[PDB]
Amino acid sequence: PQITLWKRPLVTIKIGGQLKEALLDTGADDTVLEEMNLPGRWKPKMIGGIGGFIKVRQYDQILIEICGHKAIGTVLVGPTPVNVIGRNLLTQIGCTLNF
Amino acid sequence: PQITLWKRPLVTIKIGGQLKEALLDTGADDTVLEEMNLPGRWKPKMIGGIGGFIKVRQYDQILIEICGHKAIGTVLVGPTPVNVIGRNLLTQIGCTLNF
Ligand SMILES: CCOP(=O)(COc1ccc(C[C@H](NC(=O)O[C@H]2CO[C@H]3OCC[C@H]32)[C@H](O)CN(CC(CC)CC)S(=O)(=O)c2ccc(N)cc2)cc1)OCC
């Protein structure tokens, strides 16, 4: 699809059997979801945003379907203000910026 | 043009007669730029993301040129670790997400 930006670019995602809403975020290197239960091993990690750093759980090689397009990659879970899909997965679904 | 997301979508902008580099950021509601002492009146604002909030100065009806595309709108100035072109100006240059 082609998505304009007059509203937040929110899409439905499927992860770990659950549907969620997430923001397509070209300014995010990484994908960060709010607190949730994900099956799999995880490592503690730190990530930095506009306001400083937070502690997250890093899940690797996680299947996630974004607006009908499948990706398998790293998902960070922690106190992010909103679910964001970052470039690590945006590249997998073939997402580009166009103007 | 079309910008893939393998790397940060950094572009040159022109604002207040100065050239800067900024991210095209679909996750940013509003444009936020590094400290720069623009003339005119402004309004205090707080913007939040990963890690919390920072204090910024809101200027309205500021002209920015983004890869030759002119736009005019709100620009927030403050101690941001990165310059981001947000949706308020990305719409004006006709920028879309596509996959
Ligand atoms: C102290 C740390 O220092 P740094 O490491 C941080 O640098 C940064 C690099 C890019 C960004 C941009 C930010 N990306 C982000 O948070 O991504 C994180 C996960 O992926 C990695 O990749 C980069 C960072 C992490 C979002 O696109 C936009 N945000 C909102 C978004 C939705 C609510 C928040 C999830 S917003 O908060 O910025 C914002 C809020 C209100 C506005 N009107 C305008 C902007 C911010 C900081 O830099 C050192 C020089």
Side-chain angles (χ1 to χ4, degrees), chain A residues 1-6 8-40 42 44 46-54 56-99, chain B residues 1-40 42 44-99:
Chain A
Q2 181 171 69
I3 300 174
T4 52
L5 298 169
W6 309 96
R8 281 195 184 200
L10 296 168
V11 301
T12 308
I13 63 162
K14 185 271 169 187
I15 178 174
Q18 207 175 41
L19 297 188
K20 294 175 188 267
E21 191 167 68
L23 178 69
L24 306 177
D25 187 349
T26 58
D29 300 342
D30 306 309
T31 294
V32 190
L33 307 181
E34 298 184 284
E35 172 62 22
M36 66 174 296
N37 282 296
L38 258 182
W42 59 267
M46 306 291 303
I47 56 161
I50 198 170
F53 287 76
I54 60 170
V56 297
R57 289 143 43 205
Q58 183 181 321
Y59 296 84
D60 293 317
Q61 252 174 266
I62 287 292
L63 287 72
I64 174 170
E65 188 167 10
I66 303 157
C67 203
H69 293 67
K70 304 207 170 198
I72 308 179
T74 298
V75 174
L76 311 178
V77 180
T80 178
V82 301
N83 297 328
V84 297
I85 306 304
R87 292 190 294 101
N88 73 307
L89 302 185
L90 293 173
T91 49
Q92 289 202 18
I93 64 173
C95 185
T96 59
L97 287 167
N98 304 87
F99 54 96
Chain B
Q2 175 172 288
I3 300 172
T4 58
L5 298 171
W6 295 113
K7 69 184 200 164
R8 295 198 300 159
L10 286 176
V11 299
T12 307
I13 66 179
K14 177 179 154 195
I15 177 175
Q18 273 184 320
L19 296 187
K20 300 173 169 299
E21 298 295 293
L23 271 179
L24 301 177
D25 190 356
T26 62
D29 293 342
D30 287 298
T31 297
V32 190
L33 299 180
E34 62 179 280
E35 181 47 48
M36 68 187 307
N37 175 89
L38 284 169
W42 54 276
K45 190 175 168 115
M46 283 257 270
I47 57 174
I50 281 171
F53 290 73
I54 59 169
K55 303 170 187 173
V56 298
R57 304 194 302 286
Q58 171 179 345
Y59 299 83
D60 298 323
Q61 298 303 99
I62 302 298
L63 175 62
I64 308 204
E65 192 172 311
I66 304 155
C67 326
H69 290 71
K70 294 188 176 72
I72 172 151
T74 296
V75 171
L76 310 174
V77 175
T80 180
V82 297
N83 299 332
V84 302
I85 307 304
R87 296 186 294 104
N88 72 305
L89 301 181
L90 292 172
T91 58
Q92 295 187 36
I93 65 166
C95 187
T96 54
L97 288 166
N98 296 267
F99 54 98

